[PDB]
């Protein structure tokens, strides 16, 4: 197993992870090497396929030209997985477009074929043991899984020996339920992976640990004091949103309802949905209406970024912020959501000043809505710092970068490469 920890049966939460020794804030509970992993398409050329190292001068694979490595060693070590896609990419050409989930599942089947025995990634929980929630699956989800299976057969039949359809539905359900996205220091999507021992940890909206990544290695560090006998909880989702929203996402994606202290007490819900202090206070139904509108624009925008222009997206942000501002405070999380999206759009257009402008409005409410140590907060400080630095504002930049470092030392560990890079950024300028 894993020192100082154990698997146990958590009442009403199936299997979980329990502490057998004390852990202090910033302490490393354990590490877990990726069982299976895939670099996201948009990051190819920026990161090594095999180890996810971010570097310039990465060597291009001579056959497909769509995989990049640190060196010949990374290339060679990655080949057992990359061969599933190398020739297929050139053959299908423009038609090669499997979803990330399919790519990961293909790699899972490949690993199962090469290494059927228990791996060092499965010291407490095996991939085969993953919870699937197959029985809870509705028509929409079964249809999505079937599409995924069809894509799997479509692009990966060359090297894979498929089980029956039923087992593939089980596998895909397990992947949706237990899979992790890997993000960088800015919380930018890097890829997807399976970390079986890490997936043992249950969810809480007030978690006592955070998961970070060191290449393809998952790391789990305490963000709260943990005492022997206490269950170890991580957050599966963005904790910015109020209780109802959080539970809608947890129910939809993970088929459960959280009963943590935050969901029960609902302490932060009031401040999260802060209402303007108007002479004539807004009626209850007007609040419910604006909240409904807010969720609708969130979904609408989600769709719009796929085909609308950057100016249209900014228009949606500005106009929606304008409508919401009559009822909602600037510190309101839906306002913050639109501001964050707008910041992202500004960043894409290389409109640095506008992005800084929004981020400054975003950072403090983030600090108040998120838990004490939050990758979202650290990441926001980091973005702000890099914008200030890029715009020649070294004192403000140094201050924000040091705030980011201060959180990340706890979450990533004092010796993490991301921190060395940030310190290098401070010293170089």
């Amino acid at each position: 197993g894993l020192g100082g920890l154990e698997r146990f049966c958590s009442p009403g939460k199936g299997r979980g992870l329990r502490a057998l020794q004390p852990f202090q804030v910033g302490d490393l509970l354990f590490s877990c090497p990726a069982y299976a992993y895939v670099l996201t398409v948009n990051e190819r050329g920026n990161h090594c396929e095999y180890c996810f190292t971010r570097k310039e001068g990465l060597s291009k694979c001579g056959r497909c030209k769509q995989a990049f490595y640190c060196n010949v060693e990374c290339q060679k070590e990655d080949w057992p997985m990359h061969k599933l896609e190398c020739s297929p990419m050139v053959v299908f050409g423009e038609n090669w477009n499997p979803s990330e989930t399919v790519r990961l599942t293909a790699r899972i089947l490949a690993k199962q074929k090469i290494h059927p025995e228990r791996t060092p990634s499965e010291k407490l929980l095996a991939v085969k043991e993953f919870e699937s929630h197959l029985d809870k699956l509705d028509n929409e989800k079964k249809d999505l899984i079937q599409s995924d299976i069809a894509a799997l057969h479509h692009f990966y039949s060359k090297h894979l020996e498929f089980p029956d359809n039923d087992s593939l539905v089980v596998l895909f359900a397990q992947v949706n339920c237990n899979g992790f996205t890997i993000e960088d220091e800015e919380l930018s999507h890097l890829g997807s992976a399976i970390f079986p021992d890490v997936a043992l940890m249950n969810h809480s909206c007030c978690p006592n640990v955070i998961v970070t990544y060191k290449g393809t290695l998952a790391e789990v560090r305490a963000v709260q004091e943990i005492k022997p006998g206490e269950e170890v909880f991580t957050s599966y989702i963005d904790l910015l949103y109020p209780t109802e929203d959080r539970n809608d996402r947890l129910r939809d994606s993970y088929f459960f309802t959280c009963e943590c202290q935050e969901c029960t007490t609902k302490d932060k819900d009031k401040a999260k949905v802060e209402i303007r202090k108007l002479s004539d206070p807004p009626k209850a139904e007007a609040i419910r209406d604006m909240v409904r509108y807010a969720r609708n624009v969130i979904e609408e925008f989600r769709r719009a970024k796929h085909y609308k222009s950057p100016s249209e997206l900014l228009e949606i942000c500005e106009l929606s912020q304008e409508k919401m501002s009559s009822v909602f405070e600037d510190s309101n999380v839906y306002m913050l959501h639109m501001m964050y999206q707008a910041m992202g759009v500004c960043l894409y257009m290389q409109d640095w000043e506008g992005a800084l402008q929004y981020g400054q409005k975003i950072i403090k409410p983030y600090s108040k809505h998120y838990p004490l140590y939050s990758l979202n907060v650290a990441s926001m400080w980091l973005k702000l710092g890099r914008l200030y630095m890029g715009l020649e504002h070294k004192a403000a930049g140094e201050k924000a970068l040091k705030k980011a470092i201060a959180i990340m030392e706890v979450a990533h560990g004092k010796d993490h490469p991301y921190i060395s890079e940030i310190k290098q950024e401070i010293e170089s300028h």
């Binding site: 949706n176 899979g179 996205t181 993000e183 919380l187 997807s192 963005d238 990758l375 979202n376």
Partner: peptide, 5 residues
């Protein structure tokens, strides 16, 4: 999948 954002 499991992400903070």
């Amino acid at each position: 999948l499991l992400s903070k954002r």
